[PDB]
């Protein structure tokens with residue numbers, strides 16, 4: 001639920017590319033045509049002011065996905081593209097670079113159009129445009145979003161437009177703010193998020209149908225879900241397709257344990273004995289009340305922990321995650337919802353204060369694999385009722401790797417796991 005907020009949070013805390021060891025699968029529209037992949041930005045002959053912006057942003061080498069996407073997007077005649085790769089692989093930097101290659105800042109009208117699922121996500125993309133194109137003196141950016149106060153009769157002179165589908169459609173047709181036949185590059189970013197809203201699909205297609213045939217069409221998604229793929233086929237005609245499989249999570253270098261408990265207050269005491277061993281840790285709870293209650297009790301017992309709860313704005317969650325990464329916080333308590341799909345790094349211990357279960361009540365094996373884990377990690381699961389023990393064993397059955405019973409009372413066994 002709310003993929004747009006999860007996506008926004010990952011943007012705010014993302015500091016570098018995610019390392020992927022898989023290979024890029026390329027499906028060109030012409031299977032006879034060769035596969036051209038570059039390994040440096042000089043190989044692309046970018047405009048000097050654009051290469052300057054690329055280097056000024058700390059980029060020195062194309063990312064894995066960019067090695068194939070950049071030469072394909074800069075080829076003549078323009079090639080359309082549907083690209084799929086996990087968050088943090090450089091999809092956004094890729095199409096920003098493509099947009100900045102085709103824009104002529106002397107022509108004071110929109111030439112590149114990008115659709116974002118939300119205003120906040122549009123702002124994140126606009127920041128990348130502002131950075132990479134900061135050596136384009138006359139280059140200006142317009143935000144076609146609901147909050148924009150624009151009186152009729154004006155014709156926007158910004159060369160790049162980022163916006164949400166509803167407002168962009170109004171600007172291109174009804175309100176006559178954009179002439180769509182002058183658009184040279186069209187991007188639909190975060191298609192996996194965009195489809196979460198019913199109206200967005202129809203609006204995005206209607207916008208695309210107004211563009212000229214010589215306009216380059218680009219679509220990017222974090223996931224390869226069939227619904228996104230079917231939507232993408234309706235948006236991008238005659239597409240090349242690029243895919244980078246998500247980096248697998250092995251689970252083999254992590255010691256798993258579970259603690260039988262009589263009640264909740266037992267789980268708190270059992271957690272206290274463990275805390276001595278540690279080595280930042282994340283603690284996952286089902287309800288905000290559990291997370292708030294647990295975070296408070298840990299403070300009373302002499303330890304400061306960061307809390308991740310739903311009343312916090314996305315910007316506050318990012319600030320807490322950043323402090324946790326910088327070591328200022330040694331332990332982070334979070335609900336399942338606030339942590340679902342968030343790429344938190346620098347975690348070596350996971351405490352499943354509550355076992356991850358889907359809305360069907362069954363085990364959430366996907367969430368379990370994502371939280372845990374080639375560096376040694378530790379996973380402690382807190383069982384309470386017999387139901388929870390029935391669940392835990394189903395997890396143990398799923399992965400077929402044993403979760404040894406930890407005896408929280410015995411401090412000697414706690415040192416054994418710490419090894």
Ligand SMILES: Nc1ncnc2c1ncn2[C@@H]1O[C@H](COP(=O)(O)OP(=O)(O)NP(=O)(O)O)[C@@H](O)[C@H]1O
Nearest residue numbers: 015016017059061062063087088089090091092093
């Ligand atoms: N060629 C590059 N070299 C180094 N860092 C890069 C490069 N391209 C992008 N990055 C960085 O890698 C991170 C992810 O880049 P970004 O373009 O936002 O990825 P993404 O695939 O669009 N993410 P998402 O929109 O959440 O699916 C950011 O910190 C970028 O600054």
Ligand SMILES: [Mg+2]
Nearest residue numbers: 091092190220
């Ligand atoms: Mg992206």
